[PDB]
Amino acid sequence: RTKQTARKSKAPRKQLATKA
Amino acid sequence: HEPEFIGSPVAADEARSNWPKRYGREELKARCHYRSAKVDNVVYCLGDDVYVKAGENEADYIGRITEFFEGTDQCHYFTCRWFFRAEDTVINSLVSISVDGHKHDPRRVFLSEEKNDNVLDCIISKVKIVHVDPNMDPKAKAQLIESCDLYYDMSYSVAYSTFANISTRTATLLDLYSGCGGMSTGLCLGAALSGLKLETRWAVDFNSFACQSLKYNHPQTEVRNEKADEFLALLKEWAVLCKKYVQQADEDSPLDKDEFVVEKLVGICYGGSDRENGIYFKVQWEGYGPEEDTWEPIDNLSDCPQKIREFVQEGHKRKILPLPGDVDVICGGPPCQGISGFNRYRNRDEPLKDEKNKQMVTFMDIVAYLKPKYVLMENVVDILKFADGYLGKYALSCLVAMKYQARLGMMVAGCYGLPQFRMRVFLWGALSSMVLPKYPLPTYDVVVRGGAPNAFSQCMVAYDETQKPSLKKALLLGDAISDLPKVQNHQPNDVMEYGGSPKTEFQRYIRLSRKDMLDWSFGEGAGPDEGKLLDHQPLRLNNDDYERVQQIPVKKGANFRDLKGVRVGANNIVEWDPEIERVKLSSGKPLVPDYAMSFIKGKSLKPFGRLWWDETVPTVVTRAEPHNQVIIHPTQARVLTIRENARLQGFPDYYRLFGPIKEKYIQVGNAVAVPVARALGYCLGQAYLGESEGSDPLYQLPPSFTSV
Amino acid sequence: SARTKQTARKST
DNA sequence: ATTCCTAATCAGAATTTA
DNA sequence: TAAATTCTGATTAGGAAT
Ligand SMILES: Nc1ncnc2c1ncn2[C@@H]1O[C@H](CSCC[C@H](N)C(=O)O)[C@@H](O)[C@H]1O
């Protein structure tokens, strides 16, 4: 057999704190 | 018949130049590129739009081919960038909905920039997709969608769920569910800063004390004390009346039993508290004072037609009520009480059963009827979590089904200069003729006291960890309230004086006059009460609660566990030490209440907890009782006052509130943090004036936004 | 000529 | 990494008094 | 009554452990 299924596709962290 | 590439390999120089990441020293690198490929007896070319095979019993994908290449693994690959269906975006199941007859077109997709690499064997078939300019002529539109299988007029971006177009000035604002005016005030202050004179012309709220607060601070605002759905029915009936009317001394007449000569018409409404649906006018009777005015159904006024014509001709000139097109912006923060995780009685199976939750729909019904240029809608983060975000996605799906540009963001109040956390959801909408506004980046740091839901982490308005600049230090409680004089449990004075100068930068800002805030609600010259300490009054606890907080020690983190008779046990579960008999107050009721020991399996440190100067309040809420929350003042025997809470919410001190103390607490507890609204107001004004820049969803606020 | 006063009915 | 547990959510509702 | 008083759940991000 059958037509192979295609691939459909981490974000950078957001930093609210001072150090991390 | 196997899938293969058609034609000669793309000239090496041109192949490397166009797709440089495929050559040179885990992205799939190419040995050579092609212009065409044949799959199942069909020839496909670069740029073709195709259907692509997906998971079992899942809708086929839709993609625009951008590369035909053979990898360094001898395999045949193609690259497409994905088109999103409406249900492929964050809307998901809410593609089913309807807003004033508008539904999602099945032929309308959204071009993304998401790419993927797949083998040729995945391509199903070609599909003709056309690009419709949203600002085209409607006739030229129809002939273009007539030509197509699918079409797109906007792009979709996962970041902040953006739907967007491809590739002194005055403005009117309507505040639905206006409250005491936090959101509408901030918007116009931030607008004014960007150069746009945004004016809150209309406000609707069925709480009279909220309207009394907003009307006092905004005398020109036509604030209507009525439900939003009645406001909507009135708007429709107002258009019909306007259509009907637009461009010596009277002799006496006999009057029947209840017939009286009218002087003028001084009001108009649809239904209301004791009335049923239909237009009523507030009639002023000749020879009678305003106290004798009454509401009368329009059918009782057929014998005074000129008074109606005069009222409508006259009200249409000042736009006492907006016709479609009169409204440039619609903001609103509809009730969150049916949504918020505080409510242990929500029903996740019927998220629209609560009349509070239905006001979300009524908000978009009003958007649908007035078609403002910009829509700004606020609610709590649980709107993306409760019932799997049903009501959050309902709101976004309404905007895009109406062909609005839309964006979704989560903003943290403290990030703009408050000792709060208070993450809130903000939904931008903008007509295809306008620039979609951005979200403003945090100007301060915060103590993080909550996170975003995983399904919406990409809508958090914040700096990336890799690119965060040095921001202003986090504001703490002392920076907001150390200014203020001492008050007691019983404190009934609406208006008192400050017992000192402002000590901090935040306190100097929160004390600024109206002119300094760019608050033009009183026009030239200062308004009232600039210089007075307003509503610095706590919730007047009863004798039992008062003596209870009187016994809470003035320590950091002092709570009910510090009272005589309670000690801690294993796993931090509170108990009585039997050494002490249960203490009673002068009333004969227990010093510690039973619920305090029963609260969260006896593990909570909240009951009768005291705040401290180096702490933050995560959410200023509408209730001020110290039973299930930490709201006792650090040094004084009381809870935080209305004014202290309003400072944590970012209200300028001149913003006077009205009503009972409990109602004043509700007004500040429901508000949108005024600095948050002021920041969004700058992005709204920059976008409205066509002075924004670029496709980026995030905006660094200018240095001018944080004054001297 | 002079017109007639405009009236309404007062629901009580 | 895995489990476990805490903290966090612009309160509503029942019951009990005047 | 209507006002006051008494109570207190369902999730989930993220934090401690390991
Ligand atoms: N059905 C309804 N019709 C009209 N207003 C309603 C309503 N249900 C609730 N409200 C009002 O909607 C308001 C939401 S509080 C929002 C306040 C505002 N965003 C601010 O920042 O100040 C409440 O004040 C409540 O009185």
Residue numbers in the entry:
A (entry chain P): 2 to 10, 14 to 24
B (entry chain A): 133 to 157, 168 to 309, 338 to 417, 429 to 889
C (entry chain Q): 0 to 11
The authors write:
In plants, DNA methylation widely occurs in the CG, CHG, and CHH (H = A, C, or T) contexts, with the maintenance of CHG methylation mediated by CMT3 chromomethylase. Along these lines, a previous structural study of ZMET2, a CMT3 ortholog in Zea mays, reveals that its methyltransferase (MTase) domain is packed with two H3K9me2-binding modules: the chromodomain (CD) and the Bromo-Adjacent Homology (BAH) domain, which link ZMET2/CMT3-mediated DNA methylation to H3K9me2. Base-specific interactions and DNA deformation coordinately underpin the substrate specificity of CMT3 and ZMET2, while a bivalent readout of H3K9me2 and H3K18 allosterically stimulates substrate binding. The structure of ZMET2-hmCAG-H3Kc9me2 complex reported here provides a molecular basis for the activity of ZMET2/CMT3 as a maintenance methyltransferase of CHG methylation.
We crystallized the complex formed by the core fragment of ZMET2 (residues 130–912) harboring the CD, BAH, and MTase domains, cofactor byproduct S-adenosyl-homocysteine (SAH), the 18-base pair (bp) hmCAG DNA duplex, and a peptide comprised of residues 1–32 of histone H3 harboring the Kc9me2 modification (H31–32Kc9me2), which mimics H31–32K9me2. The hmCAG DNA contains a central (mCTG)/(fCAG) site, in which a 5-fulorocytosine (5fC)-containing fCAG step was introduced to allow for the formation of an enzymatically trapped, covalent ZMET2-hmCAG complex. The crystal structure of ZMET2-hmCAG-H3Kc9me2-SAH complex was solved at 2.4 Å resolution. Notably, the target 5fC (fC10) breaks away from its Watson-Crick pair Gua10′ (′ denotes the base on the complementary strand) and approaches the SAH molecule in the active site of ZMET2, where it is anchored through covalent linkage with C517 and hydrogen-bonding interactions with G514, P515, E559, R603, and R605 (expanded view in Fig. 1b). There are two H3Kc9me2 peptides in each complex, with one associated with the CD and the other associated with both BAH and MTase. Unlike the ZMET2-H3K9me2 binary complex in which the BAH only engages the very N-terminal tail (residues 1–10) of the H3K9me2 peptide, the ZMET2-hmCAG-H3Kc9me2 complex reveals a bipartite interaction: residues 1–10 of the H3Kc9me2 peptide is recognized by the BAH domain, while residues 14-23 run along a surface groove formed by the MTase allosteric loop, helix αQ and the β11–β12 loop. Of note, the ε-ammonium group of H3 K18 is recognized by ZMET2 Y302, D645, and M641 through direct and water-mediated hydrogen bonds.
